[PDB]
Amino acid sequence: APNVVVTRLTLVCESAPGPITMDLTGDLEALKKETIVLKEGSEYRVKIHFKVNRDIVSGLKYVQHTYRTGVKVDKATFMVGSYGPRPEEYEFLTPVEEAPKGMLARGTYHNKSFFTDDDKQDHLSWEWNLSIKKEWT
Ligand SMILES: N[C@H](c1ccc(-c2ccccc2F)cc1)c1nccs1
């Protein structure tokens, strides 16, 4: 196994009716067909779960590109930092944001995420899609 293994992404969202999560050790091609529903304007954080198996690592970074029709790609980079090896996964959470709101902001957002580091290692790259809706259903 590699030293760094990305295991899961969770959208932390107090107001959501149920868990919003994806197993990133699974089939990343199938993951593209999933659609996460977020009610417009909901507060959320992105939580990345990962394991460090063998050696202390430094300079971890989470990079998230969000595509939306008609708008320039939104590119966000987060410093994740240094972690030692242990059996239990670590969790990194982005700062809280407000999901888009209004009828013109509803519908599909396409995300491409990267877990990487100062050494530009591809710990994991993955796509996942979000649908912003008026209600949770
Ligand atoms: N600011 C918007 C934008 C940015 C991020 C998200 C988002 C990404 C992951 C989880 C939940 C989210 F709400 C949605 C909309 C964009 N502007 C230009 C392209 S995307």
UniProtKB/Swiss-Prot annotation:
One of its GO terms (cellular component) is extracellular exosome. Transmembrane segments: none annotated. It is found in: Cytoplasm, Cytosol. One of its GO terms (biological process) is cellular response to redox state. Keywords: Acetylation, Cytoplasm, GTPase activation, Phosphoprotein. GO terms for molecular function: GTPase activator activity; GTPase activity; Rho GDP-dissociation inhibitor activity; small GTPase binding. The modification N6-acetyllysine is found at K39, K61, K112. The keyword Membrane does not apply. Its main location: cytoplasm. The modification Phosphoserine is found at S82. Detected in bone marrow, thymus and spleen. Interacts with RHOA. Interacts with RAC1. Interacts with RAC2. Interacts with CDC42. Belongs to the Rho GDI family. Regulates the GDP/GTP exchange reaction of the Rho proteins by inhibiting the dissociation of GDP from them, and the subsequent binding of GTP to them. Regulates reorganization of the actin cytoskeleton mediated by Rho family members. This is Rho GDP-dissociation inhibitor 2. It comes from Homo sapiens (Human). The lineage of its organism: Eukaryota, Metazoa, Chordata, Craniata, Vertebrata.
